[PDB]
Design a protein around this ligand. Structure first.
Ligand SMILES: [Cl-]
Ligand code: NA
Ligand code: NA
Ligand code: NA
Lengths: 74, 35
C-alpha cells in the first residue's frame, strides 16, 4: 500500500533538510513532542525516540540510515 | 569546506521545514501505541 498520508507529509518536510541535519533535527522534534505532550510512560518515551530515529529510512535518506541512539533526556 | 560552500544551517532548515510538524504528529501517534 501507499503510506499513511501523515507519514508522507513528514517525508516531504524532512526532504527540506540536508542529510547531515536530519538526525539532529529529528532529535529536536522528538524532544518537542515528548515535552509538549507530557509523555512519560517508559515504553512510550522509548518508542517516541525510536520512531524519530527510523524516519530517514522511509524518507529515502539512504546516506543517513537509522539515526544513532542517544540516551533519552530525563 | 570554505566561505562559499553550501554551509548547511540545521536550525534554520528545521524552522523552514515547519519544525517537521508532520513528523512530530507521526512520532506522537507511534509513541502512544507502545504496548
Ligand atoms: Cl496505508
Ligand atoms: Na526538552
Ligand atoms: Na502536556
Ligand atoms: Na531552509
Amino acid at each position: 500500500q501507499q503510506r499513511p498520508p501523515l507519514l508522507r507529509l513528514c517525508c516531504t518536510q524532512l526532504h527540506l533538510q540536508n542529510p547531515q541535519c536530519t538526525c539532529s533535527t529529528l532529535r529536536r522534534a522528538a524532544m518537542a513532542t515528548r515535552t509538549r505532550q507530557g509523555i512519560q510512560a517508559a515504553s512510550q518515551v522509548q518508542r517516541l525516540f525510536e520512531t524519530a530515529r527510523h524516519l530517514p529510512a522511509t524518507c529515502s535518506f539512504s546516506q543517513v540510515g537509522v539515526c544513532p541512539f542517544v540516551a533519552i533526556p530525563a | 569546506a570554505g566561505p562559499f560552500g553550501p554551509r548547511p544551517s540545521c536550525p534554520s532548515q528545521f524552522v523552514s521545514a515547519h519544525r517537521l510538524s508532520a513528523c512530530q504528529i507521526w512520532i506522537h501517534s507511534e509513541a502512544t501505541s507502545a504496548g
